[PDB]
Enzyme design. Structure first.
Site, mmCIF file in Angstrom:
data_model
loop_
_atom_site.group_PDB
_atom_site.id
_atom_site.type_symbol
_atom_site.label_atom_id
_atom_site.label_comp_id
_atom_site.label_asym_id
_atom_site.label_seq_id
_atom_site.Cartn_x
_atom_site.Cartn_y
_atom_site.Cartn_z
ATOM 1 N N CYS B 105 -59.432 102.790 8.138
ATOM 2 C CA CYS B 105 -60.048 102.794 9.695
ATOM 3 C C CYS B 105 -61.689 102.798 9.394
ATOM 4 O O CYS B 105 -62.650 102.878 8.714
ATOM 5 C CB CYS B 105 -59.822 103.308 10.592
ATOM 6 S SG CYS B 105 -61.214 102.625 12.503
ATOM 7 N N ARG B 108 -64.849 104.263 12.222
ATOM 8 C CA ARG B 108 -64.484 105.738 11.917
ATOM 9 C C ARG B 108 -66.021 106.168 12.998
ATOM 10 O O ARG B 108 -66.088 107.533 12.654
ATOM 11 C CB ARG B 108 -64.055 105.758 11.117
ATOM 12 C CG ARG B 108 -62.424 106.711 11.236
ATOM 13 C CD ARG B 108 -61.569 106.772 10.162
ATOM 14 N NE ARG B 108 -61.845 105.782 8.804
ATOM 15 C CZ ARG B 108 -61.760 106.769 7.250
ATOM 16 N NH1 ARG B 108 -61.163 108.234 7.463
ATOM 17 N NH2 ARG B 108 -61.641 105.720 6.208
ATOM 18 N N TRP B 277 -62.585 98.068 19.406
ATOM 19 C CA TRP B 277 -63.827 96.604 19.432
ATOM 20 C C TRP B 277 -63.121 95.919 18.725
ATOM 21 O O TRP B 277 -63.077 96.379 17.545
ATOM 22 C CB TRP B 277 -64.687 96.801 20.064
ATOM 23 C CG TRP B 277 -66.043 97.399 19.607
ATOM 24 C CD1 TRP B 277 -66.407 96.967 18.295
ATOM 25 C CD2 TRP B 277 -66.714 98.577 19.700
ATOM 26 N NE1 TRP B 277 -67.664 97.764 18.102
ATOM 27 C CE2 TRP B 277 -67.587 98.632 18.694
ATOM 28 C CE3 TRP B 277 -66.381 99.732 20.741
ATOM 29 C CZ2 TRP B 277 -67.883 99.884 18.980
ATOM 30 C CZ3 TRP B 277 -66.657 100.599 20.614
ATOM 31 C CH2 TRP B 277 -67.678 101.027 19.587
ATOM 32 N N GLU B 282 -61.105 89.951 11.323
ATOM 33 C CA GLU B 282 -59.737 90.828 11.919
ATOM 34 C C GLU B 282 -59.476 89.450 12.605
ATOM 35 O O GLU B 282 -58.339 89.166 12.334
ATOM 36 C CB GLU B 282 -59.768 91.697 13.095
ATOM 37 C CG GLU B 282 -60.356 92.657 11.888
ATOM 38 C CD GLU B 282 -60.065 94.022 13.222
ATOM 39 O OE1 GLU B 282 -58.743 94.550 13.739
ATOM 40 O OE2 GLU B 282 -61.160 94.626 13.480
HETATM 41 C C1 HEM Z 1 -64.811 100.846 17.678
HETATM 42 C C2 HEM Z 1 -63.528 99.999 17.399
HETATM 43 C C3 HEM Z 1 -63.302 99.833 15.803
HETATM 44 C C4 HEM Z 1 -63.196 99.387 15.055
HETATM 45 C C5 HEM Z 1 -64.198 98.259 14.628
HETATM 46 C C6 HEM Z 1 -62.223 99.054 14.082
HETATM 47 C C7 HEM Z 1 -61.823 99.379 12.798
HETATM 48 C C8 HEM Z 1 -60.698 98.792 11.803
HETATM 49 C C9 HEM Z 1 -60.210 97.772 11.252
HETATM 50 C C10 HEM Z 1 -60.884 96.824 10.661
HETATM 51 C C11 HEM Z 1 -59.035 97.640 11.068
HETATM 52 C C12 HEM Z 1 -57.889 96.929 9.651
HETATM 53 C C13 HEM Z 1 -56.572 96.451 10.704
HETATM 54 C C14 HEM Z 1 -56.687 95.252 9.882
HETATM 55 O O1 HEM Z 1 -57.604 94.625 9.584
HETATM 56 O O2 HEM Z 1 -55.078 95.483 10.203
HETATM 57 C C15 HEM Z 1 -58.756 98.888 11.445
HETATM 58 C C16 HEM Z 1 -57.390 99.830 11.601
HETATM 59 C C17 HEM Z 1 -57.123 100.807 11.509
HETATM 60 N N1 HEM Z 1 -57.778 101.870 13.034
HETATM 61 FE FE1 HEM Z 1 -59.608 101.617 13.698
HETATM 62 N N2 HEM Z 1 -61.837 100.470 15.042
HETATM 63 C C18 HEM Z 1 -62.253 100.577 15.600
HETATM 64 C C19 HEM Z 1 -61.754 101.559 17.036
HETATM 65 C C20 HEM Z 1 -60.016 103.042 16.368
HETATM 66 C C21 HEM Z 1 -59.902 103.885 16.609
HETATM 67 C C22 HEM Z 1 -60.341 103.706 18.582
HETATM 68 C C23 HEM Z 1 -58.558 104.106 16.869
HETATM 69 C C24 HEM Z 1 -58.252 105.013 17.286
HETATM 70 C C25 HEM Z 1 -58.042 105.892 18.011
HETATM 71 C C26 HEM Z 1 -58.797 103.207 15.636
HETATM 72 C C27 HEM Z 1 -57.327 103.738 14.349
HETATM 73 C C28 HEM Z 1 -56.927 102.907 13.747
HETATM 74 C C29 HEM Z 1 -56.062 103.021 12.467
HETATM 75 C C30 HEM Z 1 -55.278 103.871 13.044
HETATM 76 C C31 HEM Z 1 -56.024 101.926 11.359
HETATM 77 C C32 HEM Z 1 -55.211 101.129 10.556
HETATM 78 C C33 HEM Z 1 -53.555 100.815 11.443
HETATM 79 C C34 HEM Z 1 -52.338 99.818 9.878
HETATM 80 O O3 HEM Z 1 -52.552 100.283 9.355
HETATM 81 O O4 HEM Z 1 -51.841 99.280 11.185
HETATM 82 N N3 HEM Z 1 -59.573 102.251 15.792
HETATM 83 N N4 HEM Z 1 -60.105 99.782 11.795
HETATM 84 C C1 LIG Z 2 -47.692 97.856 11.107
HETATM 85 N N1 LIG Z 2 -48.214 96.690 10.363
HETATM 86 C C2 LIG Z 2 -49.357 97.117 9.803
HETATM 87 C C3 LIG Z 2 -50.633 96.702 10.117
HETATM 88 C C4 LIG Z 2 -50.666 96.318 11.272
HETATM 89 C C5 LIG Z 2 -52.175 96.026 12.627
HETATM 90 C C6 LIG Z 2 -51.758 94.813 12.402
HETATM 91 C C7 LIG Z 2 -53.086 93.915 12.889
HETATM 92 F F1 LIG Z 2 -53.369 92.640 12.539
HETATM 93 C C8 LIG Z 2 -54.076 94.545 13.274
HETATM 94 C C9 LIG Z 2 -54.331 96.017 13.317
HETATM 95 C C10 LIG Z 2 -54.993 97.682 14.099
HETATM 96 C C11 LIG Z 2 -56.342 96.472 13.887
HETATM 97 C C12 LIG Z 2 -57.012 97.316 14.916
HETATM 98 C C13 LIG Z 2 -57.054 98.222 15.348
HETATM 99 C C14 LIG Z 2 -57.835 99.275 16.496
HETATM 100 C C15 LIG Z 2 -58.000 99.540 17.751
HETATM 101 C C16 LIG Z 2 -59.276 97.895 15.899
HETATM 102 C C17 LIG Z 2 -59.667 97.231 15.602
HETATM 103 N N2 LIG Z 2 -60.428 96.862 15.294
HETATM 104 N N3 LIG Z 2 -58.856 96.364 14.869
HETATM 105 C C18 LIG Z 2 -52.787 97.082 12.786
HETATM 106 CL CL LIG Z 3 -55.390 91.328 15.682
#
Ligand code: HEM
Ligand SMILES: CNCCCc1cc(F)cc(CCc2cc(C)cc(N)n2)c1
Ligand SMILES: [Cl-]
Ligand code: HEM
Ligand SMILES: CNCCCc1cc(F)cc(CCc2cc(C)cc(N)n2)c1
Ligand SMILES: C[C@H](O)[C@H](O)[C@H]1CNc2nc(N)[nH]c(=O)c2N1
Ligand SMILES: C[C@H](O)[C@H](O)[C@H]1CNc2nc(N)[nH]c(=O)c2N1
Ligand SMILES: [Cl-]
Ligand SMILES: [Gd]
Ligand SMILES: [Gd]
Ligand SMILES: [Zn+2]
Lengths: 401, 401
Positions: B105, B108, B277, B282
């Site tokens: 993430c 964070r 958000w 993305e």
């Molecule tokens: C508030 C603005 C937030 C931004 C800008 C953000 C940004 C991101 C981005 C860019 C990713 C990459 C995922 C992808 O590209 O597929 C990600 C993953 C993730 N975020 Fe954040 N996020 C936000 C909020 C949160 C919140 C509120 C939580 C949990 C309470 C969170 C937990 C996670 C987790 C667990 C992942 C990895 C998920 C996965 O690997 O499938 N995020 N986030």
């Molecule tokens: C199970 N496969 C692993 C990847 C899962 C995944 C796909 C995705 F498009 C988007 C996310 C999370 C993206 C996200 C989540 C949140 C909470 C905020 C933010 N800006 N972006 C996870």
């Molecule tokens: Cl998405």
């Protein structure tokens, strides 16, 4: 046997080649250090046997006479003198295999077409210079670039080694100022420091090619000026942005790495400069746009009238692409071999499928294969990779001071 | 302890926090598997004690009376019931910490400002749906997005799991064609098929919002339609490319991940959707340009009158840059919260500095932290990182079907 998936297509393979990867990397079950650039008599025979073994494996000659015959003399040679000498075809095979094994090289589809210059009969600093100069002339080949490695002699216990003190054969000067800032390349100040304190009279501006600090065993290094005619350079212009030429940007034609230790069959060659041709992002994105290199991004953005007052205009992105366009355009106009990151990564995917059939997988370092711009627009981005260390190989080594 | 360098600036830290890594990843000294997407009472007890120690550390009452009382209470309740219950403040702290510990993430910097909704008293799928609607309404907040998570009843012995079958709360349908093709979002074909199979009347558009499939314990999933007026969307236009609006593209405001498992002190919460958000890449790069997703890149480049016959024109890079411009512009125009990859990676750098001060390190996954375009133009690119698993944590879990 790690399961490897491509997320674009859905295809799955298994890396069976990883099972034979020894010289331990930096990662443990408890933490991954994959993103780190630098990871933190009986023996010489063991690394020698296995190398000889895979050599004959390749040419269908395991279960031979020549196989055990070659096995026998190497142990005899180490028994007598403590080291051994490589057959020329072995040296060639070792050179190519090392390239094949480099996890961080995206250009390995070419690994089979490499020109090996044997310089093991070298004995001083002027002979080295002549070898390097032959290399550069041959590799450059008036812009039709040809991959090449020049192998200098194997290091032997007692009495020193050959070392090229520059990181590449062609490097631009980095000059300190009344303050701390640098005119020229900030990457190469440590060496520009030593070029002057060994007696080179420092040039003027941003693009001054540095002299080769070449070093023969024991007796200290000596400077060597490169012939301007030998050092092929490309002036940078943009196909439609008329003012880009006025920025006065140039880069050299030949990427030639001269500080890595070549290791074949347990033999260590501190001087073994290899060379290929550039991927355009190397010059355009990393050399010219990195904050700690030429750092030109803002300057090009101002010229393009871009709104640098907000990150969300994506002005950094826009100017970076045009810089890359200029690099491709300029090298092509000057008929100098270069490959764009899309062509290059697509060939790498092709290399991956080849290596799957031939060797059962391929060591690849994701962070280094995926290009520094437009990463997810290239096919390697969606390809999981397994990183590990195979022999023979190129390794990093301490700076010779 | 692992030493870590920032190459842009030259900074050097040591990740001592990695030493407390309460779990083990996929990498061995033999092979790095970093790029891979997918890597009782006594142990339940030691997990719980770990978390309680964490909680009483955070409120600055380590080793106190109240601390040792809770420890004793938990050891007692696991004895009588085989499990235990979190206090509300323990649950809030645990949810924040799970976000804080999430290595992939980039967002964070915000981990402390999280709205935690306690739905642990939820009793049916119908109630589940009411809790979810409230979450969406609160988090969306008319375009001024707020981070939240809703926590549904924990995994318990004797009773099945609450589960949201949808991977996000808002998803567009993906309908198979007979070109072999997919109309809509190809990433959502399976969940779309499930919905239809569970009685949903499918639409035929490219941006049809999916119904929710919600699973109460020991129950089949139940279908629920989201009210159109709860799902805030953003039509996509470009600030200087007026034909762009005629593509008919849209994306939704709220990214709400709903299929991950929340683990706090050994207790498992199989249903706890969380939302933040979007970062613009993305949407712009991954969701719209991935060849296996909406795959609009070529059609955009053609409309832009770029030369798509050759790669060296960098048509791909140019089309993608404008797609991201369109996303940023469109959301800002609609007054819906959005962050660009430059601002986001910049704030994550501040997060790393905060975390090094606070905890002596930060778990981070380089390949997920570096944006999918313009990687080395962002400061996270030149930052070495250590990836490892701390608890509390969000984990992947198998699909319920
Ligand atoms: C508030 C603005 C937030 C931004 C800008 C953000 C940004 C991101 C981005 C860019 C990713 C990459 C995922 C992808 O590209 O597929 C990600 C993953 C993730 N975020 Fe954040 N996020 C936000 C909020 C949160 C919140 C509120 C939580 C949990 C309470 C969170 C937990 C996670 C987790 C667990 C992942 C990895 C998920 C996965 O690997 O499938 N995020 N986030
Ligand atoms: C199970 N496969 C692993 C990847 C899962 C995944 C796909 C995705 F498009 C988007 C996310 C999370 C993206 C996200 C989540 C949140 C909470 C905020 C933010 N800006 N972006 C996870
Ligand atoms: Cl998405
Ligand atoms: C012929 C075309 C070639 C291309 C397009 C190419 C491309 C690249 C690129 C882009 C990198 C990334 C390094 C960085 O950005 O810092 C790299 C690394 C590397 N390449 Fe190649 N290369 C070529 C030829 C060769 C040859 C001929 C050799 C050896 C005989 C070689 C061996 C290596 C090694 C050992 C690295 C790792 C560098 C490091 O760890 O710093 N490559 N290559
Ligand atoms: C302290 N030194 C550590 C970094 C070594 C290094 C950096 C770099 F940017 C580029 C290279 C070589 C890149 C290269 C090498 C070759 C042979 C071809 C090609 N196209 N590109 C090495
Ligand atoms: C195979 C590869 O690791 C995979 O496609 C990853 C790479 N990095 C990523 N990074 C982010 N933020 N999101 C992703 O989906 C991915 N995909
Ligand atoms: C921190 C990170 O590992 C480091 O900056 C690496 C990432 N990938 C790279 N990839 C290439 N080709 N060249 C580099 O210098 C780097 N730098
Ligand atoms: Cl370079
Ligand atoms: Gd002007
Ligand atoms: Gd226009
Ligand atoms: Zn690893």
């Amino acid at each position: 046997f790690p399961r490897v998936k491509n997320w674009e297509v859905g295809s799955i393979t298994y890396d069976t080649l990883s099972a034979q990867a020894q010289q331990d990397g930096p990662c443990t079950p408890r933490r991954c250090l994959g993103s780190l650039v630098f990871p933190r008599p009986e023996q010489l025979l063991s690394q020698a046997r296995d190398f000889i073994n895979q050599y004959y494996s390749s040419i269908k000659r395991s279960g031979s006479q020549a196989h055990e015959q070659r096995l026998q003399e190497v142990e005899a040679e180490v028994a007598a003198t403590g080291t051994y000498q490589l057959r020329e075809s072995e040296l060639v095979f070792g050179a190519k295999q090392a390239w094949r094994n480099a996890p961080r090289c995206v250009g390995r589809i070419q690994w089979g077409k490499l020109q090996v210059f044997d310089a093991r009969d070298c004995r001083s600093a002027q002979e080295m210079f002549t070898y390097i100069c032959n290399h550069i002339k041959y590799a450059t080949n008036r812009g039709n670039l040809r991959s090449a490695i020049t192998v200098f002699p194997q290091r032997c216990p007692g009495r020193g080694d050959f070392r090229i003190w520059n990181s590449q054969l062609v490097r631009y000067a980095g000059y300190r100022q009344q303050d701390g800032s640098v005119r020229g390349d900030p990457a190469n100040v440590e060496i520009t420091e030593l070029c002057i304190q060994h007696g080179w009279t420092p040039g003027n501006g941003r693009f001054d090619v540095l002299p080769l600090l070449l070093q023969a065993p024991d007796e200290p290094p000596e400077l060597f000026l490169l012939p301007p005619e030998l050092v092929l350079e490309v002036p940078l212009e943009h196909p439609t942005l008329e003012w880009f030429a006025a920025l006065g940007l140039r880069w050299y034609a030949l990427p030639a790495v001269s500080n890595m230790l070549l290791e074949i069959g347990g033999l260590e060659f501190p001087a073994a400069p290899f060379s290929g041709w550039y991927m355009s992002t190397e010059i355009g994105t990393r050399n010219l746009c990195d904050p700690h290199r030429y750092n030109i991004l803002e300057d090009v953005a101002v010229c393009m009238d871009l709104d640098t007052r907000t990150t969300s205009s994506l002005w950094k992105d826009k100017a970076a692409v045009e810089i890359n366009v200029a690099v491709l355009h300029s090298y092509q106009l000057a008929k100098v071999t270069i490959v764009d990151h899309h062509a290059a990564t697509a060939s790498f995917m092709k290399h991956l499928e080849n290596e799957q059939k031939a060797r059962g997988g391929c060591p690849a370092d994701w962070a280094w294969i995926v290009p520094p711009i437009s990463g997810s627009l290239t096919p390697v981005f969606h390809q999981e990779m397994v990183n590990y260390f195979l022999s023979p190989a190129f390794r990093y080594q301490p700076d010779p001071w």
